[PDB]
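Hey Z.,

So I finally got round to the potassium ion thing we talked about over coffee. Here's the setup:
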Amino acid sequence: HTYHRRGLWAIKAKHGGALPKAEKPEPKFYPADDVKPRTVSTRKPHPTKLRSTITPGTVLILLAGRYMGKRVVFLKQLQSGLLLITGPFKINGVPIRRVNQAYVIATSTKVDISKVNVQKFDDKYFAREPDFKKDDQKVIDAELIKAIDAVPDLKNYLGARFSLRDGDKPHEMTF
Amino acid sequence: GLRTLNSVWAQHLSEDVRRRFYKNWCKSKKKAFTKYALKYDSDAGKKE
Amino acid sequence: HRFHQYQVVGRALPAPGDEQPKIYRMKLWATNEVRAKSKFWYFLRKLKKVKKANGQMLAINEIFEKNPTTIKNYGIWLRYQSRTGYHNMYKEYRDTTLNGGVEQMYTEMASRHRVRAPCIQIIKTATVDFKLCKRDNTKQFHNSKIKFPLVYQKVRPPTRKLKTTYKATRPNLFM
Amino acid sequence: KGRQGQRVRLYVRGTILGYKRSKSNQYENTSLLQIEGVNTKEEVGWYAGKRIAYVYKAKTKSNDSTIRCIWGKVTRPHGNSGVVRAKFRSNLPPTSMGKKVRVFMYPSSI
Amino acid sequence: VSGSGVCAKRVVVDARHHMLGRLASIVAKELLNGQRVVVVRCEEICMSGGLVRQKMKYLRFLRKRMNTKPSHGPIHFRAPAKILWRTIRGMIPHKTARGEAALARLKAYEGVPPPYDRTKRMVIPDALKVLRLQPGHRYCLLGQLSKEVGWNYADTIRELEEKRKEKAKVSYDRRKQLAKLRVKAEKAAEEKLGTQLEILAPIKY
Amino acid sequence: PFKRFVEIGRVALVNYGKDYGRLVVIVDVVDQNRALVDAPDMVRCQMNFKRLSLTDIKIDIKRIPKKATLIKAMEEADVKTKWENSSWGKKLIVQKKRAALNDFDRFKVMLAKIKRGGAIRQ
RNA sequence: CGCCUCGACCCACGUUAGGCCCAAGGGCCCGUGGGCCGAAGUGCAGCUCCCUUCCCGAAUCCUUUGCAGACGACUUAA
RNA sequence: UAAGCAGAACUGGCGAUGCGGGAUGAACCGGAAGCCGGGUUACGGUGCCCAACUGCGCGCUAACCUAGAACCCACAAAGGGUGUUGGUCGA
RNA sequence: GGCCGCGCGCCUAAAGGCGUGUCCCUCGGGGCACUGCGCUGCAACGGCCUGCGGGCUCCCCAUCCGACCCGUC
Ligand SMILES: [K+]
Ligand SMILES: [K+]
Ligand SMILES: [K+]
Ligand SMILES: [Mg+2]
Ligand SMILES: [Mg+2]
Ligand SMILES: [Mg+2]
Ligand SMILES: [Mg+2]
Ligand SMILES: [Mg+2]
Ligand SMILES: [Mg+2]
Ligand SMILES: [Mg+2]
Ligand SMILES: [Mg+2]
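And the result:
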């Protein structure tokens, strides 16, 4: 509940802000109606907040899509705000993908991914426009299968889909 | 209440009683109980 | 607690006739302070000749149970109005506070005699030693070897989350 | 057991009880829904905002499919015992009361 | 009162020693919500107030009849299952198509006819007499009331029910032998895989 | 011949409350519906018998023991683990345990239960 | 009886002033891609780039009768 | 004698007014109103019909008279009871 | 549930954000402040577009709720 504009300072931004007078900047057709021109908007929409239970290397259950119920490891949160996930593709067959923060559930099981390089993966990599994608996927699992093998039973856990069964109350389950 | 369990008929039925099963006895082929009577001839039929 | 005990102090308005009038105090049982002061001015008008318009309210303080962890025997002398006449009666109760006894008294009068709160006047309240208790059903709980079973169990789930319409077998309860 | 059909279930089964009602008039803008396993007004808050789908079979094919879907969400609790109010894009047909609805977990706060 | 929410194909309720109007109230809500309910052993439903009060209540009901054409008037069913059917109908908007459909999902029987003799029969906790009635107060059984007012199939119901209980008693003896065999099997299989089942120990009941 | 009575020293289990699952000792009886109950971790208060389930444990005390006297009897009469090692007290314990298990542990319980189940059949 | 143009998993009787219990609040499930000891029965890997439902021989009429009848219907015969 | 009778005083109401409750009803209780979305209340209710607890708590009652169960309101009396439960004053 | 009008003329930083001097405040670190001119319709992504697609104020039917026949004294 912090008041950013609590004080009339405005100078911690532009300390050397004592500057001079501003300098203000044929149609070939006239539209017959006074339409205010559309310029690009100068508003910064304050990027989305990551859920505090999702941290790099934590496990996610997918809630919708063609991979509903897939137990998947979380890697990174992209600039657009979509989480970066991998299956990995060897165990459950889920490739590298970006998923919305909704449609996933953050479990309390974690994996260390510190020595894993996820840098070239970003929003531009998923631009709607494959052999090298197979290589990138191939070189990101072998860096992660071993850490999955480090924890007992984590491999068979990641290779199974989550499902609700008789008598299961999602609002009581710990995960 | 009471319910009919099953019924067993005799091998020979006169035509007087077989007329009771027809609205028009003389226009029909008079086939009533003709195949039922065959159980009394074989041995599987007698078993039933 | 539903009922509270208050000590209300007031007097007639200081007038040139007296200028130092007498002080009157009462111990009244009410649900809050506003209802305690109203009942005080009711008794001052009817018992003395000082009503609220000619009087001054000096103090109002709530009385509290000294030891709310022990069990006392509580006698209450009361005046109540029935459908035909007025009668006074003596009642005895067992409680950890005199507040509970007064709530018990009001509930019992409502059930056994169909008498509402307005038609009741608490004449006197006191604590009675177990040697001097008069009513039965108070002495029978003075047994130091008091022993009995629970003849009505009220089989129910604990927190309403475990409630189901159907059950696979009949309950077994014993005492 | 070797069964066929759906392999995973990521929804809980709800039943439509009716409409927001009084003794003398009713309101189609909100439906009353009972979710399996939800027994209190307090644990309804977990499901508040969760998406809901009503699935029924129509008579003609639409996209080479004979099944239609109407989407809604859980809006608030109704009463003390776990029944909830739900708002759908279009009001549910009164013929749908007594039928089944699917309550997902798609908008997740956890 | 809302529905069960259990969303099954059909629930079979063993009506023995339930209070009639409290059982009918819960069943009516289930039917109105879309559940199929099968009620068996309707001859052993209980009504508070003994036989005498319940019998004269029926006799007053038996008095009611259309003066000019009785076969049009109220129909007074004598069997316990039809009596419970009519008690439930009184709690349902049965002149609407919704209540017509609701009442078509209810099946009521005297005794336990097949196939429900081999299925699971549940109970309603808040309709059971043992939780609803003080132990000293009077009550009667539905079959006793029905027998007093014209029902004539109490003997065949009783004879069939004795035969059913004999068969169930034999199936119970067999199930106990298979349970002792099972406990020996889980004991021997406990040591053979003793190491693997360490995680199940703290939740063993 | 009933099995459990309420008297001075009966250990009871609180059902149906915020304090559900806690153990209290009956130290005094108010009337037919209420009893004074005292525990190691709470101040003495009266409770309705409708919210108490009597256990099979009973300790030795007088009517109004001090808190220190109550603690000693609850140790001389070894109540905490007698409650916990009984099947009744155990059921409440593992009910908490099962609900506490998270998704990964529940998947491992499934792996162990399947292994255990196939061994019984063999 | 005769005659043929979305795991839909689960069987004790009986009693609650009694039979370890104190609710199936359980248990089970790779959960992971010939008598019916007749109430008789359905019996014992990607790019699908971030959600779009998870698609599984007689009868009738015309004729006859009169044990029937307002007419139909009914009992007969052909 | 009384009357949903006949006649006056003050105010409100119906007539001229829907809407929620009183099962139903000109007048009773609540409340007065453009077409809507969201939130909350009044009166009245939360076993089913019927939306909302078979909720938490103490007593009383047992009706072999159709026990009893919502202002107006749809009735009951004098008098009785060794039915049962509280009291008061006495031997 | 309904709505979409701070940011840059210094630098670094995906971006949120940080980075100057002055006086005062104490007890570690801030606070109140410099105020000079201008410009000034929030976004991201998806499916579909001649089809068994979308819509509908039109017609018929089903269901739930509501609903007594107008005029008149
Ligand atoms: K046939
Ligand atoms: K009396
Ligand atoms: K006229
Ligand atoms: Mg309701
Ligand atoms: Mg008759
Ligand atoms: Mg007029
Ligand atoms: Mg008029
Ligand atoms: Mg509103
Ligand atoms: Mg109750
Ligand atoms: Mg009325
Ligand atoms: Mg009298």
